[PDB]
Design a protein around this ligand. Structure first.
Ligand SMILES: CC(C)C[C@@H](C=O)NC(=O)[C@H](CC(C)C)NC(=O)[C@H](CC(C)C)NC(=O)OCc1ccccc1
Ligand SMILES: CC(C)C[C@@H](C=O)NC(=O)[C@H](CC(C)C)NC(=O)[C@H](CC(C)C)NC(=O)OCc1ccccc1
Lengths: 232, 202, 247, 196, 204, 220, 240, 229
């Protein structure tokens, strides 16, 4: 069994493997997410339609459970692995606790999985950062972000991947109670934030929403175009 | 079954019957129960045929490898020790009574008894098997110190002949082996060559 | 030993997996595999590299493998690595059939294999599988499908794609001449020959250098067929006639 | 012994079960539910040794739900039945076998209604109707007498009531109330309990 | 006793360039019948069938495991398995569990995919092949099937005569067995066609 | 089950009946109980049919691997040693009673291996349910250094006694003669018992059977 | 020709020409001992002769030897590193004993050489360990093929010889033996021993004293491996 | 313990240099030739010893795998012996399961699988050998080659080892599909003679033939007659 220490400290106390994993996340596609009063929205900048690729099989937004869904930014193959592990954990928690997981709980589980991979033998850190959104049994919307280092936090609005810094600066200036006043206004804010990074806009973005006590819904291309036109 | 071994000044004499049974049926009536462990070391096998053959082969492999490593002939005590270690360790699974007799330069002719359970003890003469229970009195009465090779052969033949006569699990022919520094001389007594003792007439 | 370790599964200072990138480089030096999706069915067209005059053709196909009663795949890259993955695919498909008594959906089979590939790139200290695959199949959930997987473990569904030598040229041509939703098996075959003709530079499509397999549904049962030599020759002849008339 | 019954119609499956949980001689619970919702169109009815039923049923429920979450579509009733049979058969010869008798009812968009019978030996069978427990010895003949393939769901409930009434008259165990559910193309519908 | 827990009966017979395999339909737990359409004869190929009798759970497990192995073999070899090879594969599968075996006694029937030569065989529950040129029986009514087959079988029978002989043997054997019966299904495998028939049998 | 072996002047003659019973009913009327271990070694099997088949097949495979590596003919002692060592390891749960016989560089050798792993090298042996009946003929008529024809007659008679005096033995008699430069495998060496001729005709005329449903599936 | 890449002179992996430099270095480690051994095969005898160097009188000459008995009928002469040779001799003794226990007859010399060669080949393929820096020559009498002489080497290559040598003067001995073998091959027992001794004396350019060489022989009449005494060696030396 | 990391990795250009270097060892090996006749297969190779001392009959190069499969190599002998042992085991395992001789193609696939494992496993170098496998199954001859990388091909005629490129050119001009076994043996011997660099005797070459009767290694007396003709 290969048992070398891939991740180790370096002078000044830096885990270069973790840093390099974060660089992989930055090279990934841009993803955005906002926490509305009664809605949570996730937007992803589509790399390219490619005119021949089945969009059904390249989705960057997945549903961990009925009440939880997440979007990632980084290595696609790594994200698929973390998604499957999270889904299995959600069912296990349902089995042994007889209740749906909370967004914090599943975020903590994913965060621990990533941390363990940065301090284990014979493996490299995961190369993805994930935004997890959902609704708890209490009905409070939640939005969490996890880094490859295993750290996680609760956000009201954040962006990851390429152009994260610019989008986050845009969100900070234009996030307010008035902006998230209505469900439609919340969706427009996500689209406007994405448009700050994606050039073509409209066509090259995938948007999904999750309302209280409702399953994940993916906005159709026509619906996105209508919202984009309204923003313009 | 009846296995006997006697020690004289210079070597040992081994003897056994030639009957193997599967109940009341004699599967083999000329079986050889004296197994050469080494050049001048023999073992007399009693009990389970499969168990004794398996253990005898295992010790033969161990003793031969041991002798090659140390460029000297093996000790009869060492042969007995290997038998004891196997029989004691697997006493639950094994049903085998072994008599180990042979000659080595250091101690001369020796006889060791390894009954069921893995015990080991050196004796002037040893008997074992199903039929050995019928000649305990005879050997205790007729054994004398300082016998010769010829007398020991006659002593062993007489003892086995009596046991084979009175035991239903013993019979066939008597197989004898005399081991000394010169070598191993094997003998078979059959038919009229077996000692005979007249029956009564009421 | 630390000194002799190659450190295959680690991140580069730019957040890149060099061993994966180099493996994909090896893919570009392999034969050209073509896959096209049509309403009638799906087809796989590959360029044959073992074209020596003394080779004997006795097998089912050089690069087309039957993974299941209703699925097939083509490979590009290390032949020996491809053989390992084809066996794993057949095992995965049969394990699903044993468990559920229903043929495995195509997307699930591709995901299962791609999980094996991803594991090799993340941990173990071993080199990644230097092979890229194309899959064609039919299932009751999505009908005819076409998938492509890379050494990195990524995968995706396509209506038409190409891997191997001159893949970029083939992709740009398929982008130009593919009619999304209006394609038939006959038209897909003609497009495949046209793309293979141009992508196989320094060649004339002698019909010994191309293997074509088609997947279709007939009377409720999937039928996977490898076109015979006569059929391929006829397709090439028709393409030659069309090109000549286009002048 | 607990009682299960299922009747399959042209476009529906009607399943019923008793609602008694008895420890030794005292009914500890009078509103027990023996039906497990595998998916939006599959129900699993489990009766057998205490602990084995819940542990096996809940384990299968989690796996079926996981398959739905992973692939985006739910398992078909036939696939779920064979999946359940595989797990039961695999554990049969192990050190922790499950002593559970199952009834799997579900509706498929293409194949239609399906009722599956599975004993604790993991022998799967597909039948128009089936029953489990000691009541099966007493209600099965009634179903054989009055059941037709084209039975409407209204006549199915009447036939179900006939079987339950026979249990009241002739069975020795006290089974006052029963849980009734029906599966059709619209999902799982909870009908009113048949009580006495 | 374990074999008679579920009951069942299977028989295969040989004709001139044709084979017949028959099985009863009853599925029951001891004295109670549960279903009268239980499958015991499974197709392993175009002209290759395996009939399993014994514990119902083991009948389904063995058939599924056998198909798992046969499917992998055909894909690897790129050819249809021969009847003899299938018998060896079944024997290997059954003997893999010699201690704690599967409680079933398969019987195989089919034509060789190349020369279309008839083939029938049987196996013990631990995988002891037995190839015969007349017929094979397996189930709870083995003694009755032997009596009928021994007296009725004739050599070089056309498919029509073969069907009558195997059907008569099956009907009159199960009719004298309690936990087996409730219908009979017969497959006649010829060079170019498969004829599946369900017989009119007592249902008591 | 009657399997017997005799060592004659030039080689070995092995014999066996052809009958397997499942309970008290004849399952197979023609079973090959004389197995092939190597070109010069054969082994008759008795006891559990599956165990004997698996045991002989496994040892034959191992010996074939051994023969290929060494380049020489296999030895009977090697086959005997392999068989007993495996059987002993299984503590008699593999019910294989075997009569091993072959001719090798050291001349003919005949063994008898028992399920528990005990072997016996003898000039003539018998195993199976009819073993005692066969041994009666061997003890009565065996002579050392017999001619081939005389040895064949003796083993055939020995197997015949078990067939006619044991309910577990019957049907044909198989023989196998192994010499230094010959190997005759006489599968149906003799046929003492034959089924009686049928006196009446019971042919089922077409249409005598009622059919509920029919389905024809033509094959390409 | 002598190109290198990565770690091919440090571990047993192929060089740009596919040469396995580490295996080649192991071959060259045989000469570090400074001794030479010669083996010859006759009509009904096999003889192995090796140098016997005793640096000091404090050493117990009875223990300084390079001829080992593997079985009662097989003997070997080891050349190269002493510790590696002893370990290989121990492995050969185990393999011969195990063969006898499993198959019921003494291991043939060729088969024993094959097994040791197979063990050695593993060390070349696996990079964890290094090859043994020693060479083994085995002699014995085959029940059908007569006298046999076989030689193993660190690379795992083995072959049977009419006569061979190992050590510092292997090439010179091979040339000497090749010249002798090209002539008649009657090679009585006395001639075989004389041929082995004269070859070693010629290549080493020394007139051996009775206590300066070791001789081991196997003969058809007496197949048991035997090591000649100093008196017996002197008689042969005097005759030649 | 042993190293658990692969010694064969991908170069920046996308090549497995260790496999390429392994093939270099094969090319430096002794010549080997195989020809598929109409009714058989012939494997021939050059067995030249460095001196008269070497016993020609001691170790063979054309080794049988089963009653109907043969094997010849070009490269390192020790690695050939390892693969010869594994091939024999795989043939026996197949026979035990299926009670039928392993088809030539199936044996080639399994052996090629073993070679693949050694080029991907941890702490091991690839085999420095290329195999030529001949068989007769279903009334048809078969001839396969197995490279160190684990890839195999089906050949009508091919050559390996030193001067294999020239040998293949010679085979193409001389090979005919409709050939009897006797004619094929002559061509195989002539192909070896094209680069032998010496005088050829039955003790300097090894020949094996596979046909309906099975696979057998021609005795030196037979090789003498073929050389004379
Ligand atoms: C020293 C040897 C000659 C062994 C000999 C001792 O005298 N043992 C015996 O005679 C004992 C006597 C018994 C009452 C314990 N018998 C045995 O060991 C017998 C001998 C076989 C040849 C059948 N073994 C035995 O019963 O197990 C083998 C077996 C296995 C299956 C069926 C029948 C027999
Ligand atoms: C190859 C020979 C052993 C054939 C023959 C000769 O004795 N064997 C037999 O007749 C024995 C009889 C038994 C009482 C020992 N029967 C068998 O071996 C029969 C197989 C026949 C249908 C071919 N096996 C059988 O009934 O299996 C029962 C069983 C189940 C589990 C373990 C051991 C035995």
């Amino acid at each position: 069994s290969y048992d070398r220490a891939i991740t180790v400290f370096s002078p000044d106390g830096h885990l270069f493997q973790v840093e390099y994993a974060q660089e992989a996340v930055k090279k990934g596609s841009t993803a955005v997410g906002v926490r509305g009063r009664d809605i949570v929205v996730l937007g992803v900048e589509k790399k390219s339609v490619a005119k021949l690729q089945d969009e059904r099989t390249v989705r960057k937004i997945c549903a961990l459970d009925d009440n939880v869904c997440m979007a990632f930014a980084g290595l696609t193959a790594d994200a698929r692995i973390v998604i499957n592990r999270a889904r299995v954990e959600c069912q296990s928690h349902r089995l042994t606790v007889e209740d749906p997981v909370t967004v914090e709980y599943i975020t903590r589980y994913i965060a621990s999985l990533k941390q363990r991979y940065t301090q284990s033998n014979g493996r490299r850190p995961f190369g993805i950062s994930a935004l997890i959104v959902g609704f708890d049994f209490d009905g409070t919307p939640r939005l969490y972000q996890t880094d490859p280092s295993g750290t996680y936090h609760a956000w009201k609005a954040n962006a990851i991947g390429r152009g994260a810094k610019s989008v986050r600066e845009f969100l900070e200036k234009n996030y307010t109670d008035e902006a998230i006043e209505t469900d439609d206004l919340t969706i427009k804010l996500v689209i406007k934030a994405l448009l700050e990074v994606v050039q073509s806009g409209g066509k090259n973005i995938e948007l999904a929403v999750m309302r209280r006590d409702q399953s994940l819904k993916i906005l159709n291309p026509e619906e996105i175009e209508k919202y984009v036109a309204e923003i313009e | 079954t009846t296995i006997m071994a006697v020690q004289f000044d210079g070597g040992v004499v081994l003897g056994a019957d030639s009957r193997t049974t599967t109940g009341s049926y004699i599967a083999n009536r000329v079986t050889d129960k004296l197994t050469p462990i080494h050049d001048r070391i023999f073992c007399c096998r009693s009990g389970s045929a499969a168990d004794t053959q398996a253990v005898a082969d295992a010790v033969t492999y161990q003793l031969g490898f041991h002798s090659i490593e140390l460029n000297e002939p093996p000790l009869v005590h060492t042969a007995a020790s290997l038998f004891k270690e196997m029989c004691y360790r697997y006493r639950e699974d094994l049903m085998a009574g072994i008599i180990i007799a042979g000659w080595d330069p250091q101690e001369g002719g020796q006889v060791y008894s390894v009954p069921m359970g893995g015990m080991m003890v050196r004796q002037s003469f040893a008997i074992g098997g199903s039929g050995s229970s019928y000649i305990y009195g005879y050997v205790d009465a007729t054994y004398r110190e300082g016998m010769t090779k010829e007398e020991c052969l006659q002593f062993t033949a007489n003892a086995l002949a009596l046991a084979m006569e009175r035991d239903g699990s013993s019979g066939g022919v008597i197989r004898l082996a005399a081991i000394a520094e010169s070598g191993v001389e094997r003998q078979v007594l059959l038919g009229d060559q077996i000692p005979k003792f007249a029956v009564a007439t009421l | 030993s630390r000194r002799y370790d190659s450190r295959t599964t680690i991140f580069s200072p730019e957040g890149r997996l060099y061993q994966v990138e180099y493996a994909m480089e090896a893919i570009g030096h392999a034969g050209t595999c073509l896959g096209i999706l049509a309403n009638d069915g799906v087809l796989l067209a590959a360029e044959r590299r073992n074209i020596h005059k003394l080779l004997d053709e006795v097998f089912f196909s050089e690069k087309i493998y039957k993974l299941n009663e209703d699925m097939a795949c083509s490979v590009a890259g290390i032949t020996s690595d491809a053989n390992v993955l084809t066996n794993e695919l057949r095992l995965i498909a049969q394990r699903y059939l044993l468990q559920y008594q229903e043929p495995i959906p195509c997307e699930q089979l591709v995901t299962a294999l791609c999980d094996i590939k991803q594991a090799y790139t993340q941990f173990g200290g071993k080199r990644p599988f230097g092979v890229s695959l194309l899959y064609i199949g039919w299932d009751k959930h999505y009908g005819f499908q076409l998938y492509q997987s890379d050494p990195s473990g990524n995968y995706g569904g396509w209506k038409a794609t190409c891997i191997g030598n001159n893949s970029a040229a083939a992709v740009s041509m398929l982008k130009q001449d593919y009619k999304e939703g209006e394609m038939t098996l006959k038209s897909a075959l003609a497009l495949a020959i046209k793309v293979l003709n141009k992508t196989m530079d320094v060649s004339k499509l002698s019909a010994e250098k191309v293997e074509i397999a088609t997947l279709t549904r007939e009377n409720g049962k999937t039928v996977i067929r490898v076109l015979k030599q006569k059929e391929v020759e006829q397709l090439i002849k028709k393409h030659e006639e069309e090109e000549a008339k286009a002048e | 012994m607990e009682y299960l019954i299922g009747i399959q119609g042209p476009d529906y499956v009607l399943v019923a079960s008793d609602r008694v949980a008895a420890s030794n001689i005292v009914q500890m619970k009078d509103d027990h539910d023996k039906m497990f919702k595998m998916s939006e169109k599959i129900l699993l009815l489990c009766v057998g040794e205490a602990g084995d039923t819940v542990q096996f049923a809940e384990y299968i429920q989690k796996n079926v739900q996981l398959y739905k979450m992973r692939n985006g579509y739910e398992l078909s009733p036939t696939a779920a039945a064979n999946f359940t049979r595989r797990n039961l058969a695999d554990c049969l010869r192990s050190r922790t076998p499950y002593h559970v008798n199952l009834l799997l009812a579900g509706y498929d968009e293409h194949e239609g209604p399906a009722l599956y019978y599975m004993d604790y030996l993991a022998a799967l069978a597909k039948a128009p109707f089936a029953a489990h427990g000691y009541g099966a010895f007493l209600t099965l003949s009634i179903l054989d007498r009055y059941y037709t393939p084209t039975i409407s769901r209204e006549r199915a409930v009447e036939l179900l009531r006939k079987c339950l009434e026979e249990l009241q008259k002739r069975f020795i165990l006290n089974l006052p109330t029963f849980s009734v559910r029906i599966i059709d193309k619209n999902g799982i519908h909870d009908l009113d309990n048949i009580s006495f | 006793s374990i074999m008679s827990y579920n009951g069942g009966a299977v028989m295969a017979m040989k004709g001139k360039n044709c084979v017949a395999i028959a099985a009863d339909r009853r599925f029951g737990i001891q004295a109670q019948m549960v279903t009268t359409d239980f499958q015991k004869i499974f197709p392993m190929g175009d002209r290759l069938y395996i009939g399993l009798a014994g514990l119902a759970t083991d009948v389904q497990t063995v058939a599924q495991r056998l198909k798992f192995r046969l499917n992998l073999y055909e894909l690897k070899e790129g050819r249809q398995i021969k009847p003899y090879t299938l018998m060896s594969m079944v024997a290997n599968l059954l003997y893999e569990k010699r201690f704690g075996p599967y409680y079933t006694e398969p019987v195989i029937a089919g034509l060789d995919p190349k020369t279309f030569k008839p083939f029938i065989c049987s196996l013990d529950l631990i995988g002891c092949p037995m190839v015969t040129d007349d017929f094979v029986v397996s189930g709870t009514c083995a003694e009755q099937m032997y009596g009928m087959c021994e007296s009725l079988w004739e050599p070089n029978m056309d498919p029509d005569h073969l069907f009558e002989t195997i059907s008569q043997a099956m009907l009159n054997a199960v009719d004298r067995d309690a936990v087996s019966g409730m219908g009979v299904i017969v497959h006649i495998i010829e060079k170019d066609k498969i004829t599946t028939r369900t017989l009119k049998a007592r249902m008591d | 089950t009657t399997i017997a072996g005799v060592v004659y002047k030039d080689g070995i003659v092995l014999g066996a009946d052809t009958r397997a019973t499942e309970g008290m009913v004849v399952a197979d009327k023609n079973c090959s109980k004389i197995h092939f271990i190597s070109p010069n070694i054969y082994c008759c099997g008795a006891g559990t049919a599956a165990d004997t088949d698996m045991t002989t097949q496994l040892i034959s495979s191992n010996l074939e691997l051994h023969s290929l590596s060494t380049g020489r003919l296999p030895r009977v002692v090697t086959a005997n040693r392999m068989l007993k060592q495996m059987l002993f390891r299984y503590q008699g749960y593999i019910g294989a009673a075997l009569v091993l016989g072959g001719v090798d560089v050291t001349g003919p050798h005949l063994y008898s291996i028992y399920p528990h792993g005990s072997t016996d090298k003898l000039p003539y042996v018998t195993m199976g349910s009819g073993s005692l009946a066969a041994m009666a003929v061997f003890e009565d008529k065996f002579r050392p250094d017999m001619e081939e024809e005389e040895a064949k007659n003796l083993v055939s008679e020995a197997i015949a006694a078990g067939i006619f005096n044991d309910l577990g033995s019957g049907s044909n008699i198989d023989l196998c003669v192994i010499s230094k430069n010959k190997l005759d495998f006489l599968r149906p060496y003799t046929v003492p018992n034959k089924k009686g001729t049928r006196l009446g005709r019971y042919r089922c005329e077409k249409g005598t059977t009622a059919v509920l449903t029919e389905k024809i599936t033509p094959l390409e | 020709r002598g190109s290198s890449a990565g770690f091919d002179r440090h571990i047993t992996i192929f060089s740009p020409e596919g040469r396995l430099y580490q295996v080649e270095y192991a071959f060259k480690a045989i000469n570090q001992g400074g001794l030479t051994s010669v083996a010859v095969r006759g009509k009904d005898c096999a003889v192995i002769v090796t140098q016997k160097k005793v640096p000091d009188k404090l050493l117990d000459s009875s223990t300084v030897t390079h001829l080992f008995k593997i079985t009662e009928n097989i003997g070997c002469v080891m050349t190269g590193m002493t510790a590696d040779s002893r370990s290989q001799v121990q492995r050969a003794r185990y393999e011969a004993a195990n063969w006898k226990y499993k198959y019921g007859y003494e291991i043939p010399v060729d088969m024993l050489c094959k097994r040791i060669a197979d063990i050695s080949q593993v060390y070349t393929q696996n990079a964890e360990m290094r090859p043994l820096g020693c060479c083994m020559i085995l002699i014995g009498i085959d029940e059908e093929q007569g006298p046999q002489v076989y030689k193993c080497d660190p690379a795992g290559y083995y072959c049977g010889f009419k006569a061979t040598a190992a050590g510092v003067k292997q090439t010179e001995s091979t040339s000497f033996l090749e010249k002798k073998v090209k002539k008649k091959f009657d090679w009585t027992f006395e001639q075989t021993v004389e041929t082995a001794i004269t070859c070693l004396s010629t290549v080493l350019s020394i007139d051996f004293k009775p206590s300066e060489i070791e001789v081991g022989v196997v003969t058809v009449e007496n197949p048991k491996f035997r090591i000649l005494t100093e008196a017996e060696i002197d008689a042969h030396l005097v005759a030649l | 313990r042993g190293y658990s990391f692969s010694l064969t990795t991908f170069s920046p250009s996308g090549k497995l240099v260790q496999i390429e270097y392994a093939l270099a060892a094969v090319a430096g090996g002794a010549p080997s030739v195989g020809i598929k006749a109409a009714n058989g297969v012939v494997l021939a190779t050059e067995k030249k010893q460095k001196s008269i001392l070497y016993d020609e009959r001691s170790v063979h190069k054309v080794e049988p795998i089963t009653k109907h499969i043969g094997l010849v190599y070009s490269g390192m002998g020790p690695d050939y012996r390892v693969l010869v042992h594994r091939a024999r085991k795989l043939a026996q395992q197949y026979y035990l399961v299926y009670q039928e001789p392993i088809p030539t193609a199936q044996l080639v696939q399994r052996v090629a699988s073993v070679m693949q494992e050694y080029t991907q496993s941890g702490g091991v170098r690839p085999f420095g050998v290329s195999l030529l496998i001949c068989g007769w199954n279903e009334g048809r001859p078969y001839l396969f080659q197995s490279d160190p990388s684990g890839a195999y091909f089906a050949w009508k005629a091919t050559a390996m080892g030193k001067n294999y490129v020239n040998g293949k050119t010679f085979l193409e001009k001389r090979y005919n599909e409709d050939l009897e076994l006797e004619d094929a043996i002559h061509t195989a011997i002539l192909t070896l003679k094209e680069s032998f660099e010496g005088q050829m005797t039955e003790d300097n070459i090894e020949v094996g033939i596979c046909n309906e009767a099975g696979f057998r290694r021609l005795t030196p007396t037979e090789v003498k007659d073929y050389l004379a003709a």
